[PDB]
Design a protein around this ligand. Structure first.
Ligand code: MG
Ligand code: MG
Ligand code: MG
Ligand code: MG
Ligand code: MG
Ligand code: MG
Ligand code: MG
Ligand code: MG
Ligand code: MG
Ligand code: MG
Lengths: 116, 135
RNA sequence: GGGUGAUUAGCUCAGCUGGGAGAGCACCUCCCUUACAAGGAGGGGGUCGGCGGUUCGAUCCCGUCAUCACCCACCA
RNA sequence: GCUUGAGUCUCGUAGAGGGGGGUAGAAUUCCAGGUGUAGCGGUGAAAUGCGUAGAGAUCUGGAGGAAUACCGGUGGCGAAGGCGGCCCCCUGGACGAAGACUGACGCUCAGGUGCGAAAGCGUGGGGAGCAAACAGGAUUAGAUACCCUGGUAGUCCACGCCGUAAACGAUGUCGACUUGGAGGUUGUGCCCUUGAGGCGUGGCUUCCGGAGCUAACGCGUUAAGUCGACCGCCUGGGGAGUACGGCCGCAAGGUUAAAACUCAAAUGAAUUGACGGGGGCCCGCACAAGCGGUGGAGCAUGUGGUUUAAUUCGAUGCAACGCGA
């Protein structure tokens, strides 16, 4: 309910999965969906079509909460940066702003020396 | 063809109904070069199905081709070639007596189109609209 | 011999108001998987633990048996 | 005695040069919440792990540790190791500007002394990340490894210790001499700065290259050309930078440094091929799409093998097996 009439979409696209979470500007959330949360566990869950169909399920089940326009917040590289707002304007609802809020430490904590 | 394009050297159409598609079909159902014992079974099965459908002749299998047409694996030439191949190799498995009648029962179940032809179609057609990632 | 949940596909099991019982894990057979992974496809051995009681309708609730399994068990 | 080699003064300039002290911001993790529900994360694919006790995500408030994006660049400083947020205190160097000042004071330097990355060691802290040893899950035939999940010593600081490397430019130090080209940095004498610019002279660095030199690759005013001084070092591979003795030390180990024994090669560069689970470009029924077959049934032929008196001999991956017939 509550007729919020404005929203915030956090997205986090990893190298193997994408998550989408819906909230207000104030941080309390409504609903969320993952690329894992549409089936196909494993390799195929990191795909942009999976990301947009996860957005299809994500816009579902938050429908009755009264949302028209929203802002976009983007974390992590991959396919989720590019195949989510296509599903969102397939839903048609207008985008206020798109923000890349990918966390960048200024070469702070030491990463692994991985990938041999 | 690492190098060349097709020219698709053509053939002669059907004698009676004049369909180049039916000529390609009797080329399909042909084994060891027998158009005559192909076409006797073909025209006998088609003249059974015309009575058993109560409709025209060419639309009676235009329906039976469109409803067994898949999407991908794709180009329409391979679509309407694999469709006829599917009907033949579907009727090959049936436990009936003769080839024309097992083809007729296959086309009947492809008329009330939950037949073994669309059963064979809807595995690759099931991968379609379920694995739409690859490009 | 006392209480209650409980006995249901091969398994633990789960879905309930007197209305259309199963998603997942296991067994054997193909296109694809270069091959074993993955995928869909269609392959199933409910007599829902038994008897009777029901209402214009039973896994559905009740009476008992049987039977895996939880609590405490006297003083004299 | 002289002043050109080194040195001083005055003005300056650039700079992650060094030691100490403090501070700021993004982020990882942890603590406590609020929202919100069935997953998060992981790989080539899976699994261990966290999650209905509510994870991941998500907004806030806090704690603590470490390193400072972008500027950043064959850009600068230092003799070498090396040094990056900002500010403050102390401090060493390089270069430029014309003068003034002493008068060969200089070069090199075994032994000597000092510095010296990372790992480690003793003592006291701190411990957020990352991570040797370890445990589990994976792969595998096997996996004491590559991958994942964690995670102790360690990486930080204070003081001390061993003083090692592909510590490289595999090129010791100083001074001078013989053509060029294009950059980057930092100075100063000048230009109507009357145009971000361009003109000379200095310092340093990076690249292409002439003669020369070298066995070739290549070096190429910063030489591996031409000289001069001084020092360290090599004498075939292997034993071996091992032992024995000494010196050093908490040990780990370092430094100096042999002999017997064995071989006639070991190596540097370069050429021509071959190969590459090296790249680019192609070609073929090589593969994909088809269609019909074999291997499974009975028989013909042939090989291997066995036994027999002999089962004549030859051919053996394709490219021998209805072959010499
Ligand atoms: Mg200074
Ligand atoms: Mg150290
Ligand atoms: Mg310690
Ligand atoms: Mg690791
Ligand atoms: Mg050494
Ligand atoms: Mg050169
Ligand atoms: Mg020389
Ligand atoms: Mg030794
Ligand atoms: Mg060589
Ligand atoms: Mg093929």
């Amino acid at each position: 309910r509550k007729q919020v009439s404005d929203g915030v979409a956090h997205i986090h696209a990893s190298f193997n999965n994408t998550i989408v979470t819906i909230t207000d500007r104030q941080g309390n959330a409504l609903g969320w969906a993952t690329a894992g949360g549409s089936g196909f566990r494993g390799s195929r869950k990191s795909t942009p079509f999976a990301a947009q169909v996860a957005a299809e399920r994500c816009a579902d089940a938050v429908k009755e909460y009264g949302i028209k326009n929203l802002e976009v917040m983007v974390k992590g590289p991959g396919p989720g940066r590019e195949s989510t707002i296509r599903a969102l304007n397939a839903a048609g609802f207008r985008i206020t702003n798109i923000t890349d809020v990918t966390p960048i430490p200024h070469n702070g904590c030491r990463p692994p020396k991985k990938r041999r | 063809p690492r190098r060349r394009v097709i020219g698709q050297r053509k053939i002669l159409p059907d004698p009676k109904f004049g369909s180049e598609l039916l000529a390609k079909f009797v080329n399909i159902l042909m084994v060891d070069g027998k158009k005559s014992t192909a076409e006797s079974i073909v025209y006998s099965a088609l003249e059974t199905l015309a009575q058993r459908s109560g409709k025209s002749e060419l639309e009676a299998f235009e329906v039976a081709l469109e409803n067994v047409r898949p999407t991908v694996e794709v180009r329409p030439v391979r679509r309407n070639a694999l469709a006829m191949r599917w009907i033949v190799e579907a009727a090959r498995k049936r436990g009936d007596k003769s080839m024309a009648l097992r083809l007729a029962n296959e086309l009947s179940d492809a008329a009330e189109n939950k037949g073994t032809a669309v059963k064979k179609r809807e595995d690759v057609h099931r991968m379609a609209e379920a694995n739409k990632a690859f490009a």
